[PDB]
Each structure stands twice: as C-alpha cells, then as structure tokens.
C-alpha cells in the first residue's frame, strides 16, 4: 500500500459525508473510511470535491479511493473497481408535502426535477425523464438542489433515499417536504449498494479495504457506528 491513501468525497450528502460547523468531515461514510484506514495501518487524507469530479480524479491519480456513497453499477465497473458493499442505497423522490408528484413520466412531464451531476440519479432521469420532456436540472452538489427546492425553483428532486431522509426531511430545511412516491428500484441504473471506488489495477488496495471492511463488520464495529445515524438496517442484504 502507499504511505498515505488519498480518499475523495463530496461533502453535501449528510448523513454519509458532510461538513460540521468547523469544516471537519463527518458522517457514516467518513466513519467507515477512517475505521478501514485504521485497520489497514495507513494514513488517509480526505479530499473534498464535487461528486462528478470523483471518478475523473481517481483515474487521473489525484485521489486513490472514492468513499462518497458511490453506487456499484455495471457501467462504473467498466471504468473502475469497487470494494465489497459498504451499505445499501435506494433512490427516492422528494417534493412538497401534499404534492401529488410521483416518480412517473405522467406526473413529472413539464415539471422541474433536480439531480446531482455525475450521479446514477442523473443517468436515470436523463434517460427516462429528460428525453420525454421532464425538465431535469443537473447540479454541481446536493446542497444547491435542496436550496433550489426550498426556493420553489424545483418541483422535486431525486437522490439517495437515506440522504434525503436523514439529511434533509428530518432536518430544519426539509420540514415542508416529504417523499413523493416509493423508492425507484432499477437494478441497472442504481447498482448494488455503495463501495469504495478504486483504480482497476490497484488490486492490493482493494484487498486491503475489503479485509478491513470484513473485519469491522465481524467484530460489530459496523453496527455500532451505524447506530449513531440509523434506527434501521442500512447495510441492506
Ligand atoms: N456524496 C455524494 N454526493 N454522493 C452521491 C451518490 C449518489 C448515488 N449513490 C451515486 O452513486 O451516483
């Protein structure tokens, strides 16, 4: 392994990765990264960037790993490698309370729907919704999406369910909002949970992350850390 592992993340996705009032990185994904680094016996440096810049930075060797709720998809596996699953991540729409909006073309056509640039949600929305006349608006980060939603510039927004719920709906800014319809399950677009994103040739680094991850699941550390954030099974299957 290298001496220092550089880990990229976007910090607008509470409760997984965001910044506290001091600017320090916090969340479940940060906790998982730090705990794995500890077990790997390497130093880790967190590197903030826009989400859509993470895979380009990784390929350019500006970072060595991505821990940023990065869903494991077929399409991404053609470009990069992944650790074993960190946790599950379904996608779900939010809109104002009492909105009739549903995650369907019939409901959404002509409406303004925000998605994170570079995300699986943007891929889904661009292919299924933008092509058919939904005004899909892609953003550099998720904070801008929540902001434009509360300003009434957006009718709805598509992101990871747990991020929306714990990061917005249960926070002061989101009290006027609610999920619109059920989660949108689509294996091909949304993948099989999240993982550490890695260059394909970094076999040693993947093995080290995988080993640390297994170990912190085996000894209960995963569940104790998760309990800080979640009263449900975030790992999934
Ligand atoms: N830190 C973030 N903003 N993460 C966004 C992740 C969204 C989705 N899971 C994806 O892999 O595309």
From Swiss-Prot:
Changing residue 68 to A: Has no effect on the arginine and histidine binding affinity. One of its GO terms (molecular function) is amino acid binding. It holds the Pfam family SBP_bac_3. Changing residue 69 to A: Decreases arginine and histidine binding affinity. Keywords: Amino-acid transport, Disulfide bond, Periplasm, Signal, Transport. InterPro entries: Lys_Arg_Orn-bd (IPR005768), SBP_3_CS (IPR018313), Solute-binding_3/MltF_N (IPR001638). It is found in: Periplasm. Disulfide bonds join 37-44. One of its GO terms (cellular component) is outer membrane-bounded periplasmic space. Has a bi-lobal structure. Contains two globular domains separated by a deep cleft wherein the ligand-binding site is located. Belongs to the bacterial solute-binding protein 3 family. The 30-fold reduced affinity of the protein for histidine is primarily due to unavailability of one ionic interaction of the histidine side chain with the protein which is present in the other three complexes. This is Lysine/arginine/ornithine-binding periplasmic protein. It comes from Salmonella typhimurium (strain LT2 / SGSC1412 / ATCC 700720). The lineage of its organism: Bacteria, Pseudomonadati, Pseudomonadota, Gammaproteobacteria, Enterobacterales.
């Amino acid at each position: 392994l290298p001496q220092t592992v550089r880990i990229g993340t976007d910090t607008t996705y509470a409760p997984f990765s965001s910044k506290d009032a001091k600017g320090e990185f916090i969340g479940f994904a940060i906790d998982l990264g730090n705990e794995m680094c500890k077990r790997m016996q390497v130093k880790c440096t967190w590197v903030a960037s826009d989400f859509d810049a993470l895979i380009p930075s990784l390929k350019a060797k500006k970072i060595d790993a991505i821990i940023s709720s990065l869903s494991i998809t077929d399409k991404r596996q053609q470009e990069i490698a992944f650790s074993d699953k960190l946790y599950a991540a379904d996608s779900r729409l939010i809109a104002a309370k009492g909105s009739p909006i549903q995650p369907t073309l019939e409901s959404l056509k002509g409406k303004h729907v925000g998605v994170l640039q570079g995300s699986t949600q943007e891929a889904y929305a661009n292919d299924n919704w933008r092509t058919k006349g939904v005004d899909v608006v892609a953003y550099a980060n998720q904070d801008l999406i929540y902001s434009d939603l509360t300003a009434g510039r957006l009718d709805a927004a598509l992101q990871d369910e747990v991020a929306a719920s714990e990061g917005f709906l249960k926070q002061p800014a989101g009290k006027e909002y609610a999920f619109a319809g059920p989660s949108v399950k689509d294996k091909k677009y949304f993948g099989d949970g999240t993982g550490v994103g890695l260059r394909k040739d970094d076999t040693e680094l993947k093995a080290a992350f995988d080993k640390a991850l297994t170990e912190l699941r085996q000894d209960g550390t995963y569940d104790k850390m998760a309990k800080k954030y979640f009263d449900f099974n975030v790992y999934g299957d």
